[PDB]
A paper describes a structure:
The crystal structure of the caspase-11 CARD (residues 11–101) was determined at a resolution of 2.8 Å using X-ray crystallography with an N-terminal MBP as a crystallization tag. The caspase-11 CARD contains four chains in one asymmetric unit (chain A, B, C, D). The structure of caspase-11 CARD displays a unique feature that is distinct from all known death domain superfamily members, it is composed of four amphipathic α-helices instead of the classical six19. Comparison with the classic CARD structure reveals that, in the caspase-11 CARD, the classical helix H1 is fused with H2 to form a long helix that we named as H1–2. The three short helices following the H1–2 are well superimposable with the H3, H4, and H5 of classical death folds, but sequence alignment of the CARD domains shows that helices H1 to H5 are not highly conserved even among the homologous proteins. H6 cannot be observed in our crystal model. The electrostatic surface analysis of the CARD with acidic, basic, and hydrophobic patches indicates that several neutral amino acids in the long H1–2 (residues L372–S391) form a hydrophobic surface, which possibly mediates the oligomerization of CARD. Moreover, the interactions between the four protomers are primarily mediated by H1–2. Although the interface area reduced sharply between chain A and chain B, and between chain C and chain D, the area is even less between chain A and chain C, and between chain B and chain D, suggesting that B/C and A/D formed homodimers before aggregating into a tetramer. Further mutagenesis experiments suggest that the hydrophobic interface is critical for the oligomerization of CARD and self-cleavage of caspase-11 in cells.
Murine caspase-11 and its human orthologs caspase-4/5 are essential for the non-canonical inflammasome pathway. Caspase-11, -4, and -5 belong to a family of aspartate-specific cysteine proteases. Their activation requires oligomerization and autoproteolysis. The CARD mediates caspase oligomerization through CARD–CARD interaction.
Numbering used by the authors:
A (entry chain B): 3 to 172, 178 to 393, 431 to 443
B (entry chain C): 2 to 166, 181 to 333, 336 to 425, 429 to 439
C (entry chain D): 12 to 172, 178 to 422, 431 to 439
D (entry chain A): 5 to 423, 433 to 440
Amino acid sequence: IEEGKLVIWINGDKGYNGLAEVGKKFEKDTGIKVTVEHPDKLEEKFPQVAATGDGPDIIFWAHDRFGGYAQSGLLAEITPAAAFQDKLYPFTWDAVRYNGKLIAYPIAVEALSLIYNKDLLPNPPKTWEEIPALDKELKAKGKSALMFNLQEPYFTWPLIAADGGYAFKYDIKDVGVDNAGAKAGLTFLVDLIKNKHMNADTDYSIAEAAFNKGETAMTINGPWAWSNIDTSAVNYGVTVLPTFKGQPSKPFVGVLSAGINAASPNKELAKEFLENYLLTDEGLEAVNKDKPLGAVALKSYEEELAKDPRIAATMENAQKGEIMPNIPQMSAFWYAVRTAVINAASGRQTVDAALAAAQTNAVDLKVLEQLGKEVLTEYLEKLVQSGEMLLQTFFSVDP
Amino acid sequence: KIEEGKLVIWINGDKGYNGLAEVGKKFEKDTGIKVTVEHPDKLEEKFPQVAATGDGPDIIFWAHDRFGGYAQSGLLAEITPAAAFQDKLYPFTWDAVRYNGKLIAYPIAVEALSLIYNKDLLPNPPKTWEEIPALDKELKAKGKSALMFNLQEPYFTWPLIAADGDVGVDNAGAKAGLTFLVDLIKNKHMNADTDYSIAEAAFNKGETAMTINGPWAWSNIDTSAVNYGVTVLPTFKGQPSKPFVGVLSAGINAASPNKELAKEFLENYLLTDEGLEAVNKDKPLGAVALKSYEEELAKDPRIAATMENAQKGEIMPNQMSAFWYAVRTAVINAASGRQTVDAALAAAQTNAVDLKVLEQLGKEVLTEYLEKLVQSNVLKLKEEDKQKFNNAERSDKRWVFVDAMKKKKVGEMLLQTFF
Amino acid sequence: INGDKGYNGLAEVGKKFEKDTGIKVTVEHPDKLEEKFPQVAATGDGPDIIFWAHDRFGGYAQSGLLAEITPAAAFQDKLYPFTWDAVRYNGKLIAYPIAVEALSLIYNKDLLPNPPKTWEEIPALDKELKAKGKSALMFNLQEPYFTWPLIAADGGYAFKYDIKDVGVDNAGAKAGLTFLVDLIKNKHMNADTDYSIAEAAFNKGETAMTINGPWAWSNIDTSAVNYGVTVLPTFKGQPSKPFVGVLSAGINAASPNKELAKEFLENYLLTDEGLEAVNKDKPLGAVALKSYEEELAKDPRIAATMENAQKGEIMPNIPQMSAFWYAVRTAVINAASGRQTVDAALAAAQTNAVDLKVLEQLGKEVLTEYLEKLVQSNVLKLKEEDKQKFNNAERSDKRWVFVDAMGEMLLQTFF
Amino acid sequence: EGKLVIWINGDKGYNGLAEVGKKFEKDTGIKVTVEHPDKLEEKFPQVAATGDGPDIIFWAHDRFGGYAQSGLLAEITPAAAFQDKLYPFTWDAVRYNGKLIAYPIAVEALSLIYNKDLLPNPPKTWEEIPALDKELKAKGKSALMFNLQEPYFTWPLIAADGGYAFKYAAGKYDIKDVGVDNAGAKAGLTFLVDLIKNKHMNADTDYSIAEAAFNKGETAMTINGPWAWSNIDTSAVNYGVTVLPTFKGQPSKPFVGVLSAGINAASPNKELAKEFLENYLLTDEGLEAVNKDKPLGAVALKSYEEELAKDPRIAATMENAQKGEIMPNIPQMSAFWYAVRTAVINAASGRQTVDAALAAAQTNAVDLKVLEQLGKEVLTEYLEKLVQSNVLKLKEEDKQKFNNAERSDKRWVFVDAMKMLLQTFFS
């Protein structure tokens, strides 16, 4: 680790030079050089580059895959002014809340939104319960109402959690698929499949191909999919997700966050650059020019971009949507939802039996996984006397 | 990506891939079957993946070091070599390729360690290990050393370790060889930290009289002058040194509709007095499997020495851990001196069988991990592959799974988290 | 033999089997033979024959203690078909069925002169019997040996005809368990009635009918109740599936006389007076031999014990009672307490069963190599030929060959 | 609280601890009842984890360290002025992690016991043992017989020329530094087994074989502690104990255990002990009344040890304890006991050489405990599935208690929830 200057590590999602273009505004006005770098495999270098104290002082990544950094406790806290915590939506600071204090800075926001063909469906439904009758009307014209990815729990969980449902009780303690409100949401979904308003084999590609070829009226996707539906000429709107039993569908919210290192000796100067330069109207648009940040959580700027109705509804779904879990890497809980949807959609179990078995099949999958990690930890500790070769030694030929 | 009527062959860029191209189109001239010879971005792994989904080479060109993984997964078709064409290939050059009573493919080249000496520093090499310390006695007046080879890899050390004489790496004769190896180190005829880079760099500049290497090194040695000879490895106690012998073979896919014409290329065209030399012109094969034309090369005394060394050597181990790590740290500990030679052998043997225990409880825990994934049908894998998973016996479930996963949602991230 | 069946009653061969043959031999009953012979042949020694309950001989067959047995087609028709499947284990017969045991509906002829033949009569007829201060039916529900007959009454047989995880989530176990729990919500029966609470209810005489086999018969004799026993009620046109325990004679695999054990068991023990002599000391109950069983069937309860066993369920051959008992254990208590739905309780207990049995053999595997390492280091100084025996035993039974070597059993290193 | 309860092993002077304990009719007006349950050291941790048990417990110091990691005890509060009245090395014996744990009572170590009618002056070196046994074998006897099966008896000679169990670093016995493979460990070990291969000793002798042969006059010497003394006074031998012989000029180092006591962590009366201890038990007549019943051997206090030292047997016990060094407190000591012993057996059998049997034993030991922890974890996760499934009907207060306990002792907590499922892994 070095002192005298500040740095930044970002990928090719958002403009690598837009941040540079805002980068030298800092050093032009201050004199502290800010190098801006884009390491290949950023999410795979940081806990490596930081655990010994080296690396950046600040850094950028998402909030959904952020459960590998906070667990090793590295990102230092920030005492932002109350006047600063009032520049972004009050619910944004919870997405980067940990142990009680801060862990990074919100910049923008990402969430699933209801996408509908405006010519096929001029007024999209606001209610899940009215789509089966709507679909029957549309299948007589050769179309389907709603087609989105049923394979990944990321898309299907909002409806399963629509009735009094949410990921955690606030921290594991157990898998969160037990509540009887998920029975109601999962029942409705497996019905849309068994009554043939939906197919259980619909993946992301099939749902995307059906919408831009104009074969379906609605689909579930995020701002990342907006690029490919504009190549097609389908006239589409973007609105809030449909409600169920009166409660709104709440998707997962991914938020890019500007964390800063605890081994970082330029703590404050990193605050001055992010708070007073990056995180206001002038800084983001330098970033937003090279590549769009999507909806940004900064009230000042979001509203002027909220003139785009797609970006405004993307955020509206995010404010209601609940925060992407701090226990992730996509396992445990993720495994219980997916196996519950698959077995119930094919009719092997009623939904009551499916998610009850799928959840204890999840917790007992991770007692096997962590058991296997230990014997291999003991394996690895033995040959220390002398990363994928462990696959051909254990997936070898002989028994 | 499969096809009927073409032959596609894949080989490392180690080997002349142009040579096979040279032999390839001559095939399509006398026949009409257009052949394509590529050396894809690292074929050692890409093959098992694309084998399982059915595509890939019709003929795969490789050694019999790692064909364990290929035959038993069952996607390298069985062979039918006529008896009239048998009787030529060395009695032993198949034993290496013969797996599970049935033949996997046909061997081409044979590669083995050979004692490499220059003729400038000493005219005629010593034929046994025990006299090396005495000859080394007066090669330092000039300032030079007699022998430097790689001591880190068991591939080089094991020929001397087991030169004298489950069972285990700890035996009465393994002491003898190991004891002689480390006593050379304590007298500064050799150093425990000498690796492949140091040993080859010293001989190629000519301050070492003898080395132990294979024909893969001869390219760099030819390029760096040094008038050198190649002979049989030094004897220990009276028993010959037995190096690990790789035979480089030609596997053919089991998903290939053209398996008849795949042989037609290897049998009557590839392995001949002519087409063999065609690939070897651009790539030194060392010794070769055919006999009608192995002895042309045997005029070259360098290639003859490796053949005599290969006929005495063992077949490489085909399982890439345990015993290999036992011999490694047994040599490492005793060479640095911090543990007695017999203390190192005892400590190596218990770490080895404890390595295999810790290894195969992981394989049992692993087999349990995927038995749970197939049952929950998290994958939606075809009902055929799920019952076919449950039909296969316990040890091969791991392979039936991943071939029932390369098919297509992916469960490759579930498995790569397990490690 | 053991001390619960006839030692001398079967030792009376010297007076018959042996005289014709000139082959002197005779039994003796070591006490607590439960887990005591698993190793006298683990040598090649041991007796030629052993009798004991069919509970679990499969653990003593794949480990190589029981050879294949020779019943002729004419001799197999001398015993009931269902008892051959008791000792039939992976396609081979490893023993000779002698006597069998099963549940039966215990009626009494004063409250209800004609007992119910189906299960749906008892909710509707329990009414009559409810009011007057009693109850029509009640039995142990806290251990699945009693609850499984009705739960599995509609559906597949599971064990009669590979053994690992047939599964309890079948739609029939729903109908069985749903009907049973519907009996509790209508208060035809209460959720907390195990063995003694159920027997004391019938031995203090405030319930009409019960479920239990022959081992309890004497307790109803002493308490003044006039009862018989009959066949269990059918559930949805299909008979109930009570667990059929069998007493069978297996003959060792290292035995010297493979065919002399068969010639004696088949033509001398398994004949009318052969099994009789031991039935004189013993109420052998229902016997597998159709010839004599018909004469014991004068007792209408042995005929009912038999009839319930013919269509009954064969006892778990392997160590399945580790997962299955537990699978059908936790499924009932979680469902009867209203904590889970019948469907949620079945699939959970199903998957809870096979994933804890996986942990257990895994714990067996790491312990086996833990104990195996202890004998390679000679830390215990095992008299050597107590240690070749350990190294040459089957990788599974190796952990009990190690107990042979020297009661007291420490190992408390794990606890 | 209100009363004082004592646990002490049944082999000690437990009732001699009542005469001293019944003398509490002074200002304390509090009574004590001494109690001697067997398996006591096993039972205290499991019941004191729930907050019950005696106030003070007399036990060897080696297991007090395994207790205090779980916080089964409480902070000690000795004054530094009275700390000196004991022997300063005994304070390091019970000092654990940087703390105190107990108050020293007795010092216990091995010593050379000889037959004077057979052997008038003992040898002071191990090197002259083989020549002395050569003379006694001519007369039908042997020089030395002691238990070779347990490394506690063989450790003094294996450690003379610079052998140690775990190296004391700062306040801590270095666990990556094992001293059973040091130059003098080998020097002591071969000489131990050359005694066995030259037929001077025999690898089959255990404690029972040695004790009977020594008290029947069949051997001239034996190695034992103060516990075996009374059996030798019943014997017909005129015996005495003395220094242990030196090896290569250095004296042997026997393991020094101290019998001492603690004050329960959740105990309701912690200050009430401290007097019984600090002021009473530990006074000249305090230990005299328990040495009255069953002798304590060497005591940490001076003014009564000095009275005891006039009998040369306890003076030899204390002196052999001075050159000996304290037994570590740490769970890895069992891996030490396993490593040293399997090395002795295979070296005494000629099965392996001494350098070879030592190395094969050491990594056998830690590879064995690797399987132990792996066996404890699959067990721990296995019983978690048993209580979470409610198969054995508990919940009430016994279920969340178990689940809130830290994972490491989710076992002991579970089988003290037995208000049955035993060795099901042997089926």
